[PDB]
Design a protein around this motif. Structure first.
Motif, mmCIF file in Angstrom:
data_model
loop_
_atom_site.group_PDB
_atom_site.id
_atom_site.type_symbol
_atom_site.label_atom_id
_atom_site.label_comp_id
_atom_site.label_asym_id
_atom_site.label_seq_id
_atom_site.Cartn_x
_atom_site.Cartn_y
_atom_site.Cartn_z
ATOM 1 N N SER B 13 4.618 6.531 -8.725
ATOM 2 C CA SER B 13 4.451 6.380 -7.283
ATOM 3 C C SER B 13 3.921 4.979 -6.946
ATOM 4 N N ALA B 14 2.750 4.644 -7.484
ATOM 5 C CA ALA B 14 2.026 3.435 -7.104
ATOM 6 C C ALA B 14 2.824 2.128 -7.270
ATOM 7 N N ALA B 15 3.857 2.174 -8.105
ATOM 8 C CA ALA B 15 4.746 1.031 -8.287
ATOM 9 C C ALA B 15 5.489 0.664 -6.997
ATOM 10 N N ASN B 16 5.429 1.542 -6.010
ATOM 11 C CA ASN B 16 5.936 1.229 -4.679
ATOM 12 C C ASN B 16 4.927 0.869 -3.573
ATOM 13 N N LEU B 17 3.659 0.774 -3.943
ATOM 14 C CA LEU B 17 2.631 0.433 -2.981
ATOM 15 C C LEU B 17 2.949 -0.833 -2.194
ATOM 16 N N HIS B 18 3.616 -1.784 -2.827
ATOM 17 C CA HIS B 18 3.905 -3.029 -2.146
ATOM 18 C C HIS B 18 4.828 -2.798 -0.962
ATOM 19 N N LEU B 45 -5.629 -8.414 1.825
ATOM 20 C CA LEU B 45 -5.313 -7.039 2.207
ATOM 21 C C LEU B 45 -4.109 -6.513 1.446
ATOM 22 N N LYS B 46 -3.020 -7.273 1.480
ATOM 23 C CA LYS B 46 -1.839 -6.957 0.701
ATOM 24 C C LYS B 46 -2.224 -6.647 -0.739
ATOM 25 N N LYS B 47 -2.818 -7.616 -1.438
ATOM 26 C CA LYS B 47 -3.144 -7.423 -2.857
ATOM 27 C C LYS B 47 -4.040 -6.210 -3.113
ATOM 28 N N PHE B 48 -4.988 -5.992 -2.217
ATOM 29 C CA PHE B 48 -5.912 -4.876 -2.345
ATOM 30 C C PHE B 48 -5.197 -3.540 -2.224
ATOM 31 N N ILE B 49 -4.205 -3.485 -1.339
ATOM 32 C CA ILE B 49 -3.379 -2.289 -1.196
ATOM 33 C C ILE B 49 -2.527 -2.109 -2.437
ATOM 34 N N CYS B 50 -2.080 -3.219 -3.001
ATOM 35 C CA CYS B 50 -1.173 -3.165 -4.127
ATOM 36 C C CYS B 50 -1.821 -2.715 -5.427
#
Lengths: 1525, 269
Positions: B13-18, B45-50
């Motif tokens: 799943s998390a491989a799609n966080l971006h 923010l982006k990186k933190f979400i990723c």
């Protein structure tokens, strides 16, 4: 005519090497067909040896030449065929082809062909000196290569010649195999390694290549051998330097075709021998089986095996080749249980009970394999799988005939050589994971394993039995008797082959492509059998040469490569252009379908989960499918994998994925199909994953290049990163590793612990020492960085890599590879990356890498500098580079606009006598000049003119000079240039411009104070270089001739930026101080290239902004077209070599008919590049295109020459210029060039400054050069590069001027940025500081610390410090910031000067010069120098000591060290009067000691180091006198 | 978590966080106007979400300064990641606050964390966490430091910013019970605050010195009193190999498996 597209599918041959082009076969003599139920059985008897010809004898090892005889020991006589062709072997360079049956001993023929070349280079007092030649032996199989290097080593060792297998990864072992000769490899290895260029450093040292088992032309692998040889031939035609080619083949028709292919003269070069020459005659048995149902067949073949084996169950030996791993022992135990089911019949394989050594078979009992069951009985098994040593222990048992039945695999036939009385090939069919299905085994596999039939010694005649399918029964007859055609599978691979040739630059366009294909085996086959290859005879008659078919062919390849984006090729021109994707494709031997799959699939944001899928989609795997039976195990494997596949269900993607993971996770598989499959997948995976990494890295996408390199490592090492790095040292015990993995104790925390503290973690203290060794064997770099901002857009980074690990060449080997890559704020984008390679020698030596990186509008908190080993897993060091305190420079104002002016005629100055020295040269002044004119000529004020070099600023200076001329009769002017070469260049002009026409005396300053003083004051115009005008004019207060100067001119002031810049800065500053005290103004005119910060320079030199002209590089009299060519090869030799062809092309493109200058990194490189320009000049079919006069005209010029090669290069219109050439030679070459006789001149880089002859196109080749002192390459100083570029200017005629700069990958962006923009220039005075304070204190210009700070305020440094404070390590832009900074500065300069006893500091305020400093200042010697003197010279010192003490002087460290000067100076130092105490031979002080003694002994050396000697001597006397003082 | 299957579902799943990264919403609600207003640079923010995961909360610590001559706005210039592990409803991070040189120039603005399910309130676990930081840290100012909650909405990410009120701070200092409904919890305890995303400047990351930040996969290796240093470098993703040693350290194998298929065919290098 326009080409037409064709389908390459129906034009290839499926089931290649099984092809059987002929549909008809032949009996041998006594042969018969006897068909039984379910199987036809064919029998042929043994051949009858040809009777010895009249007076034909064998040759002993005596009667052949003296030298070669060595290494033949153990062997008394030559084989009949060996003896047949030895004459042509050792007496002729004519190419060879031999066709002789398996067993004839072909190697020892080729061996002789090698011993000839080994003999070609020989000396009396040394033998076989090995740096002249290298030989390449291409063998078809790996085992064969291994064992061959094994025995070749032993044999040739008497010569001491070093022969090795080429298994090398490219970069670690190149410099290793550099010293290796006669290298053995598989054709493939040679092809990749040539596509990368690992070969192009080797070649031209290659006089011989052996193609062994060349009948591999018929295999699917065939196109490779075809690609090799074609390249070799096509290449020889360009270079004109030839090579011997020795082909070895099994006995097959199409021999004359292979002859044509190898360019073997059929007359004296061709050799054919039929199947009668097999040393042990062969009786052939072939049983084809008619049974359709496989279920019954797997009985029938068993039974045929049994009957055939019982036939030989008496005194004889049988050998069974099964193509299965496990079935080696499944075939055995069937024979056993059958013999038991026979009521003990077939048993008693001996002459009795105890006879024939049954105690031999019984007493060997305990062994690793399943042998313990079989060994008590008559038979056993052999293969690579079950054991290592017991294979050799079984081979020993078979040779001595204690086992008469041995069942095995093809690797036994291909490996160490033992024969068998009779061999039996079971089934002929194998499993091909590449083909996805089962297929009959290759030609070479049977040929090899059935050529093992019968012993040379213990046997009379051999027999062999091939049990196959009846349908293929015809085929296997066409082979083992010579019926079979050798045909090329080339068409299948044609698109891939074409790419790699474009990638190497060997084919530019369609025409070169057809020319290339005209060198293929497929070409001669398409010529002599068009009927087979898809050509009707009528259209063959319509195009006899196949020009239109070879044009049609390759057109489809071109289209395929274009559609997959390997090449950009438009139909109109017919030209190809390579893309990086194409290069990656060629370099990894990955097909062009796979690569486009990667192009479309790969995106920055890919997870590992997805990376694997994309890998699985590789077109290389197209035929792999998932079988029902194995889908039971695949599921289990699917749930035991770490990386989720679950994106895919059971389909090929899943199978391949789970397989790769299984291999990495190290999992054993039950099914055999899956095992073979997995093997295929994982072996291809290295190249595949790697091409992915390369692509994704070239794109710059950080995260995925990490994920991909790590995958690469995980494949290579067969482990996940989550496992302890200590595992990559295989030297370690498994239980210990697992034990340290048990407790979680992060790996980098092992360095803190000593030998005892380590063992205490896992409670296994006995291991404590050994573990420690490995922990410190693991490669570790520590890294520091020095960062300074250059412009608001770009920062400069100096990375200092310090090796932290203990090197062991039995682990790290010859070299260790690391990628350094600077990643942006989020570790998202890779801003820059270099390949850094630390060699063996230099572990513990800190390496300094310098590179620039950009910054962007939301200035970020930091960058990261990452460094990672290529091959090493879990080996990495990251370095945050924080900008938290960064202060970016002030953005630079726009350059003063070039006004549109009526171009000024020479008729402006009302002086006729002035007009005369211009009017007959050019009619009009250029826009720069005409815009500067009124200010510089009609007005008295200080001006600054920047314009990029080639703008004509010299006559801008001459304007001011003319004004001064009107001003006063005796008017005095001093002119400065930072380059002595440039100075002489100015003097030659100005002496005629002024002294000749205007009668005004002109002078050029020199070394000596006296003579120089006398020089000025007699002269109106004094031309000088900054150092000459520092020593004189430091004392200016006393010399009235310094003070009374009217005009002062600084040319190329931007050079302040470079070293020996501070002296320039200091003299201009001083000049201003003088004009301050003299109460009269002294006009200053400064001239620079385009300068971004020109404002500061002007403010410093006192120009009002209204008289400041700073122009953009786009303003030039003659427009410039600049092109930059990136080359991705880091290793400098290979790079430099691989830009050879592009040079020629750059000429033919940009400036075909116009003058061309080529700058090169090396003194000698100039020759070589002139040569190469001429040798690839022949290629074009166009000879002597660069010579614009007849040879009769050049004779008067050539009479004056010493250099013999220069005569040649000049004869074809090239010629070169360098250090060693006599000034007459140089003047001549220059004359020939400018007059227009020769169109191209290659020149050393050093000559960029002092060269008076310009051009149209300039090509800079490889911007780095070699420095012996740190043993590394270092980039061309930027101003140099700009000068070389400015050397393409021809305003008189050309409307344009052109430059091509070929440089490394790293250095590409830097040039793209800084060649176009105006340049920033910063002060270096802060570093080179002491000397001047000392000298100035001596003049009493600095009487106390205050005077020191004041003096500082007159400088350019003062100006710049507040402009870009982070560069000068000044932390704030404030007032007290700058003030405190300058304070700390004079503080430490005066302290350091007082420590050295050059000055005395009183009360803490005042200063006075002392003895030392006085001396220093007097002789213009570095202060550290005479301090060294002060602590060195003692009461008892004498000339021995005075030599070394005067040698260590600072002014002698400017002396450089060239390529391999470590041996040279050792050879000189051996023979000098005074030896040294463990001297390092890369140190210039040692070198100057040795050169000095050499001069004292009047030894005549090479002109190279002789120049050096002269330079040392120039400044010697001063130093000596200082010692006297 | 199930620790086997549960790991992998969330991992692919998390491989799609971006993908989330480019659809984000920000709470706009009533502005106090006497309050501070916080600007979050979009890159961090982006990186933190990723790096995050859709179940375990991850958290990061905010560091910033107010722009010159504009004291009422706080630019967040830095996020620090410390050794930590989450639950679906909260995050356990150690007692020591970040200490480091690059940080000396700025002030702490509070923290930010991922929130698997969107709630229009500051979770009791949060107000309690924040108060309890504040109790032990004078460095953190009540009025100046906030909690930014970043929630995963469908195909998206959406975020709000809270301040403790003094009522809240006292409750939280006091509060023991960490359940989803502690006694005496009130909406009076927190206050929404004004926050804006920005492309005008770039924020940067601080990250643990000798390890990485994500301890979720080792819970026994994490302690409240654990000490750490920092460095300038970016965070590795949640499921990154390093955060997961136990799983790459699963090999039980005997070497001699390699005996089988001892046909070595290579031919390339």
């Amino acid at each position: 005519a326009p080409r037409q597209v064709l389908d390459l599918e129906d034009l290839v041959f499926t089931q290649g090497s099984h092809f059987m082009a002929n549909k008809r076969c032949q009996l041998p003599d006594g042969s018969f067909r006897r068909q039984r139920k379910g199987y036809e059985e064919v029998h042929v008897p043994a051949l009858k040896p040809k009777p010895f010809g009249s007076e034909e004898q064998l040759l002993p090892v005596e009667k052949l030449p003296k030298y070669a005889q060595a290494g033949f020991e153990g062997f008394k006589t030559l084989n009949r065929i060996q003896s047949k062709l030895y004459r042509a072997a050792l007496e002729t360079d004519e190419n060879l082809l031999l066709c002789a049956p398996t067993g004839a001993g072909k190697t020892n023929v080729a061996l002789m062909c090698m011993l000839r070349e080994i003999g070609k280079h020989i000396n009396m007092d040394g033998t076989i000196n090995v740096d002249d030649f290298k030989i390449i032996y291409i063998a078809p199989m790996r085992s064969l290569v291994q064992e061959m290097v094994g025995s070749f080593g032993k044999r040739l060792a008497t010569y001491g010649i070093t022969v090795a297998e080429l298994t090398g990864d490219h970069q670690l072992c190149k410099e290793e195999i550099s010293a290796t000769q006669i290298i053995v490899c598989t054709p493939e290895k040679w092809d990749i390694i040539t596509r990368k260029g690992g070969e192009r450093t080797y070649t031209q040292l290659v006089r011989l290549i052996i193609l062994d088992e060349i009948h591999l032309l018929h295999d699917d692998r065939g196109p490779v051998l075809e690609a090799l040889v074609a390249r070799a031939i096509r290449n020889i035609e360009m270079t004109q330097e030839d090579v011997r080619l020795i082909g070895l083949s099994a006995t097959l028709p199409n021999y004359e075709d292979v002859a044509t292919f190898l360019r073997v003269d059929p007359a004296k070069g061709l050799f054919y021998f039929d199947n009668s020459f097999r040393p042990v005659p062969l009786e052939q048995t072939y049983v084809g089986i008619t049974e359709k149902k496989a279920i019954k067949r797997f009985q029938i073949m068993n039974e045929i095996v049994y009957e055939k084996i019982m036939e030989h169950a008496g005194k004889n030996q049988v050998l069974v080749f099964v193509h299965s791993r496990k079935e080696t022992g499944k075939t055995a135990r069937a024979i056993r249980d059958m013999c038991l089911e026979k009521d003990t019949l077939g048993l008693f394989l001996r002459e009795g009970s105890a006879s024939t050594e049954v105690l031999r078979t019984e007493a060997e009992q305990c062994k690793n394999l399943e042998l313990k069951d079989l060994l008590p009985y008559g038979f056993a098994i052999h293969h690579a799988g079950m054991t290592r040593v017991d294979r050799t222990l079984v081979e020993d048992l078979f040779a001595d005939k204690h086992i008469q039945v041995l069942v095995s695999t093809a690797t036994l036939a291909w490996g160490v050589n033992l024969p068998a009385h009779t061999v039996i090939i079971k089934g002929t069919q194998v499993y091909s994971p590449e083909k996805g299905r089962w297929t009959e085994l290759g030609a070479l596999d049977i040929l090899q394993m059935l050529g093992r039939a019968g012993r040379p010694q213990y046997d009379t005649k051999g027999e062999g039995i091939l049990i196959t399918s009846h349908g293929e029964l015809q085929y296997y007859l066409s082979l083992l008797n010579q019926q079979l055609p050798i045909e090329s599978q080339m068409v299948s691979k044609l698109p891939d082959m074409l790419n790699a040739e474009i990638v190497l630059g060997n084919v530019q366009n369609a025409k070169d492509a057809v020319n290339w294909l005209g060198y293929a085996y497929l070409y001669i086959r398409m010529l002599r059998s068009p009927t087979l290859y898809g050509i009707s005879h009528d259209d063959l008659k319509g195009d006899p040469l196949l020009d239109q078919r070879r044009l049609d062919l390759v057109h489809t390849a071109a289209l395929m490569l274009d559609k997959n984006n390997l090449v950009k090729y438009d139909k109109k021109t017919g030209n190809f252009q390579v893309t990086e994707l194409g290069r990656i494709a060629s370099h990894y031997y990955i097909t062009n379908d796979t690569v486009q799959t990667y192009n479309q699939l790969l995106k920055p944001t890919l997870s590992e989960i997805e990376l694997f899928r994309v890998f699985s989609l590789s077109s290389e795997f197209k035929n792999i499918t998932v079988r029902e039976e194995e889908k039971l195990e695949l599921q289990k494997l699917l749930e035991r994998v770490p990386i989720p596949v679950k994106e895919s269900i059971e389909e090929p993607s899943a199978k391949i994925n789970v397989l790769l993971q299984a291999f990495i996770s190290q999992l054993k598989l039950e099914g055999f199909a899956l095992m073979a499959d997995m093997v295929y997948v994982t072996q291809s995976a290295g190249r595949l994953m790697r091409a992915i990494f390369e692509i994704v890295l070239n794109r710059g996408w950080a995260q995925l290049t990490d994920k991909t390199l790590n995958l690469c490592k995980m494949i290579d090492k067969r482990m996940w990163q989550s496992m302890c790095p200590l595992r990559q040292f295989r030297k370690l015990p498994e239980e210990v590793v697992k034990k340290i993995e048990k407790k979680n104790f992060p790996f980098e925390r092992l360095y803190d612990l000593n030998h005892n503290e380590i063992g205490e973690l896992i409670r296994m203290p006995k291991m404590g020492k050994t573990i420690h060794k490995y922990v410190h064997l693991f490669p570790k770099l520590e890294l520091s960085v020095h960062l300074q901002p250059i412009t608001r857009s770009t920062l400069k980074v100096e990375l200092t890599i310090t090796p932290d690990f203990q090197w062991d060449e039995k682990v790290h080997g010859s070299s260790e590879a690391f990628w350094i890559l600077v990643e942006d704020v989020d570790s998202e984008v890779i801003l820059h990356h270099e390949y850094f390679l630390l060699k063996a020698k230099y572990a513990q030596d800190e390496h300094l890498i310098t590179f620039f990186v950009p910054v962007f509008e939301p200035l970020p908190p930091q960058y990261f500098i990452r460094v990672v080993s290529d091959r090493w897993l879990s080996c990495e060091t990251q370095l945050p580079v924080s900008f938290r305190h960064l202060i970016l420079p002030e953005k630079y104002p726009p350059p003063t606009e070039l006004l549109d002016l009526q171009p000024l005629p020479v008729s402006a100055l009302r002086n006729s006598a002035f007009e005369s020295l211009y009017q007959d040269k050019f009619p009009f002044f250029n826009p720069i000049q005409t815009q500067v004119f009124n200010t510089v000529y009609n007005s008295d004020d200080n001006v600054f003119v920047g314009a990029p070099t080639g703008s004509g600023k010299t006559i801008c200076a001459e304007f001011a000079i003319l004004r001064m001329l009107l001003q006063s009769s005796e008017g005095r002017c001093v002119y400065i240039t930072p380059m002595e070469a440039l100075a002489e260049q100015v003097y030659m002009d100005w002496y005629e411009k002024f002294q000749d026409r205007l009668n005004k005396k002109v002078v050029l300053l020199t070394g000596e104070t006296s003579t120089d003083l006398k020089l000025l004051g007699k002269g109106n115009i004094i031309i000088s270089t900054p150092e000459k005008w520092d020593i004189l004019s430091r004392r200016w207060k006393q010399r009235k001739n310094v003070q009374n100067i009217n005009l002062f001119v600084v040319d190329e002031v931007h050079l302040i930026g470079g070293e020996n810049g501070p002296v320039l800065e200091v003299i201009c500053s001083r000049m201003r101080y003088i004009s301050s005290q003299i109460e009269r103004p002294i006009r200053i005119v400064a001239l620079s290239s385009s300068l971004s910060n020109a404002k500061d320079v002007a403010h410093w030199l006192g120009c009002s902004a209204t008289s400041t002209f700073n122009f953009h590089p786009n303003v030039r009299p003659v427009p410039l077209e600049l092109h930059i060519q990136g080359f991705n090869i880091s290793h400098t030799q290979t790079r430099l070599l691989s830009m050879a062809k592009p040079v020629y092309h750059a000429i033919t493109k940009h400036s075909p008919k116009k003058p061309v200058i080529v700058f090169v990194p090396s003194r000698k490189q100039t020759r070589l590049t002139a040569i190469d320009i001429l040798t690839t000049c022949a290629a074009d079919i166009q000879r002597q295109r660069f010579l614009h006069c007849t040879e009769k005209d050049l004779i008067p010029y050539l009479e004056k020459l010493s250099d013999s090669t220069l005569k040649e290069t000049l004869l074809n219109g090239v010629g070169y210029l360098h250090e060693g050439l006599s000034p007459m030679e140089r003047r001549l070459v220059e004359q020939l060039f400018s007059s227009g006789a020769i169109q191209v001149v290659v020149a050393s880089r050093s000559l960029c400054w002092g060269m008076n002859v310009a051009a149209h196109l300039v090509i800079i080749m490889d911007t780095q050069y070699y420095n012996g002192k740190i043993h590394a390459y270092v980039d061309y100083p930027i101003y140099d590069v700009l000068q070389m570029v400015g050397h393409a200017n021809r305003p008189l005629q050309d409307d344009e001027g052109r430059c091509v700069i070929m440089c490394q990958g790293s250095k590409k962006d830097f040039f793209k940025k800084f060649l176009y923009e105006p340049l920033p220039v910063e002060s270096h005075l802060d570093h080179c500081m002491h000397d001047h304070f000392n000298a100035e204190i001596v003049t009493k210009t600095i009487e106390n610390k205050q005077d020191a700070v004041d003096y500082l305020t007159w400088t350019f440094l003062y100006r710049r410090m507040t402009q870009n404070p982070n560069y000068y390590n000044l932390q704030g832009i404030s007032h007290r910031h700058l003030s405190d900074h300058l304070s700390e500065l004079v503080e430490q300069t005066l302290s350091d000067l007082e420590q050295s006893k050059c000055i005395s500091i009183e009360d803490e305020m005042d200063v006075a010069p002392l003895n030392l400093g006085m001396i220093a200042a007097y002789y213009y010697i570095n202060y550290t120098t005479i301090e060294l003197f002060s602590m060195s010279l003692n009461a008892k010192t004498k000339v021995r000591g005075l030599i070394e003490i005067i040698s260590n002087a600072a002014e002698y460290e400017n002396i450089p060290i060239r390529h391999h000067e470590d041996n040279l100076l050792r050879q000189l130092a051996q023979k000098v009067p005074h030896k040294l105490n463990n001297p390092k031979f890369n140190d210039p002080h040692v070198k100057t000691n040795l050169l000095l003694q050499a001069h004292l002994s009047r030894m005549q050396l090479s002109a190279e180091l002789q120049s050096d000697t002269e330079e040392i001597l120039s400044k010697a006397i001063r130093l000596i006198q200082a010692c006297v003082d | 978590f199930s620790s086997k299957t549960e790991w992998r579902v969330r991992a692919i799943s998390a491989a799609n966080l971006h993908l989330r990264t480019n659809h984000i919403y920000v709470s706009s609600d009533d502005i106090k106007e006497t309050g501070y207003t916080y600007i979050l640079p979009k890159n961090v923010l982006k990186k933190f979400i990723c790096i995050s995961d859709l179940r375990a909360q991850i958290a990061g610590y905010l560091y910033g300064v107010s722009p010159p001559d504009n004291p009422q706005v706080k630019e967040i210039r830095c996020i620090v990641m410390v050794p930590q592990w989450g639950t679906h409803q909260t995050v356990h991070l150690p007692g020591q606050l970040p200490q480091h040189e690059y940080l000396k120039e700025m002030e702490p603005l509070g923290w930010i964390h991922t929130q698997p399910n969107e709630s229009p309130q500051l979770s009791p676990q949060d107000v309690t966490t924040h108060a309890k930081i504040m109790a032990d840290n004078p460095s953190w100012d009540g009025e100046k430091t906030i909690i930014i909650t970043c929630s995963f909405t469908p195909g998206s990410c959406t975020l709000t910013a809270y301040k403790l009120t003094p009522s809240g701070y006292e409750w939280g200092r006091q509060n023991t019970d960490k359940g989803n409904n502690p006694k005496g919890y009130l909406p009076s305890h927190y206050e929404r605050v004004q926050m804006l995303l920005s492309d005008r400047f770039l924020g940067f990351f601080m990250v643990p010195a000798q390890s990485s930040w994500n301890y979720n996969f080792m819970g026994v290796r994490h302690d409240p009193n654990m000490k750490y240093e920092l460095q300038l470098a970016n965070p590795k993703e949640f499921y990154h190999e390093v955060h997961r040693p136990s799983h790459f350290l699963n090999f039980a194998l005997l070497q001699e498996g390699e005996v089988y298929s001892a046909d070595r065919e290579d031919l390339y290098a």
